[PDB]
Design a protein around this motif. Structure first.
Motif, PDB file in Angstrom:
ATOM      1  N   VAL A 264       0.862  -1.212   0.000  1.00  0.00           N
ATOM      2  CA  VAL A 264       0.000   0.000   0.000  1.00  0.00           C
ATOM      3  C   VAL A 264       0.885   1.244   0.000  1.00  0.00           C
ATOM      4  O   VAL A 264       0.546   2.254  -0.586  1.00  0.00           O
ATOM      5  N   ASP A 265       2.020   1.164   0.653  1.00  0.00           N
ATOM      6  CA  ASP A 265       2.949   2.320   0.694  1.00  0.00           C
ATOM      7  C   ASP A 265       3.506   2.578  -0.697  1.00  0.00           C
ATOM      8  O   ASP A 265       3.638   3.703  -1.136  1.00  0.00           O
TER       9      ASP A 265
ATOM     10  N   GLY B 268      -8.256   4.109   8.124  1.00  0.00           N
ATOM     11  CA  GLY B 268      -9.267   4.620   7.188  1.00  0.00           C
ATOM     12  C   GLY B 268     -10.596   4.615   7.898  1.00  0.00           C
ATOM     13  O   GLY B 268     -11.355   5.559   7.835  1.00  0.00           O
ATOM     14  N   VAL B 269     -10.877   3.537   8.579  1.00  0.00           N
ATOM     15  CA  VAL B 269     -12.166   3.427   9.311  1.00  0.00           C
ATOM     16  C   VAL B 269     -11.921   3.065  10.784  1.00  0.00           C
ATOM     17  O   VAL B 269     -12.284   3.824  11.658  1.00  0.00           O
TER      18      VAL B 269
ATOM     19  N   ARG C  76      -2.237  -9.779   6.518  1.00  0.00           N
ATOM     20  CA  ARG C  76      -1.609  -8.428   6.440  1.00  0.00           C
ATOM     21  C   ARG C  76      -2.189  -7.685   5.232  1.00  0.00           C
ATOM     22  O   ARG C  76      -2.502  -6.516   5.314  1.00  0.00           O
ATOM     23  N   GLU C  77      -2.344  -8.372   4.110  1.00  0.00           N
ATOM     24  CA  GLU C  77      -2.906  -7.729   2.876  1.00  0.00           C
ATOM     25  C   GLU C  77      -4.108  -6.876   3.240  1.00  0.00           C
ATOM     26  O   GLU C  77      -4.322  -5.817   2.685  1.00  0.00           O
ATOM     27  N   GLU C  78      -4.889  -7.336   4.177  1.00  0.00           N
ATOM     28  CA  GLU C  78      -6.081  -6.552   4.603  1.00  0.00           C
ATOM     29  C   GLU C  78      -5.687  -5.096   4.845  1.00  0.00           C
ATOM     30  O   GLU C  78      -6.411  -4.181   4.511  1.00  0.00           O
ATOM     31  N   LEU C  79      -4.524  -4.881   5.393  1.00  0.00           N
ATOM     32  CA  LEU C  79      -4.043  -3.493   5.627  1.00  0.00           C
ATOM     33  C   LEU C  79      -3.837  -2.808   4.285  1.00  0.00           C
ATOM     34  O   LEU C  79      -4.180  -1.660   4.102  1.00  0.00           O
TER      35      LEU C  79
ATOM     36  N   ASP D  94      -8.618   1.981   1.038  1.00  0.00           N
ATOM     37  CA  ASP D  94     -10.074   2.261   1.185  1.00  0.00           C
ATOM     38  C   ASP D  94     -10.206   3.315   2.239  1.00  0.00           C
ATOM     39  O   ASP D  94     -11.316   3.744   2.639  1.00  0.00           O
ATOM     40  N   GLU D  95      -9.070   3.739   2.688  1.00  0.00           N
ATOM     41  CA  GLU D  95      -9.039   4.817   3.669  1.00  0.00           C
ATOM     42  C   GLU D  95      -8.960   6.053   2.788  1.00  0.00           C
ATOM     43  O   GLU D  95      -9.807   6.902   2.830  1.00  0.00           O
ATOM     44  N   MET D  96      -7.932   6.132   1.956  1.00  0.00           N
ATOM     45  CA  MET D  96      -7.789   7.326   1.089  1.00  0.00           C
ATOM     46  C   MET D  96      -8.874   7.357   0.017  1.00  0.00           C
ATOM     47  O   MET D  96      -9.163   8.392  -0.559  1.00  0.00           O
TER      48      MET D  96
END
Length: 85
Positions: free
Chosen positions: A23-24, A63-64, A73-76, A82-84
């Motif tokens: 994600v980074d 995000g939520v 970990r992928e969930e992160l 889904d936060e941004m």
């Protein structure tokens, strides 16, 4: 925020600071800045705040809120996106 991940699994073990690196990588493309946070089950047991019953391997969903996830970990990686988004 750009990158925002919280991995709450345990200080004696590897939380979930892996799906965040992905994600980074993508959130960097947009937010050159990153913000991946990583807590242990003894300091961030707030994860389960939702259930706090079986709260051990989980991550906050930058995000939520936070969810149950041990080897997830992928969930992160999906939560930061889904936060941004």
């Amino acid at each position: 925020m750009v990158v925002n991940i919280e991995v709450f699994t345990s200080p004696t073990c590897p939380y979930c600071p892996m799906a965040i690196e992905v994600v980074d990588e993508a959130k960097k493309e947009f937010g050159d800045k990153i913000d991946v946070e990583k807590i242990d089950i003894m300091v961030d047991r707030e994860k389960a705040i939702e259930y706090g019953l079986m709260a051990v391997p989980a991550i906050a969903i930058n995000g939520v809120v936070r969810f149950v996830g041990a080897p997830s970990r992928e969930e992160l990686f999906e939560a930061i996106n889904d936060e941004m988004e």
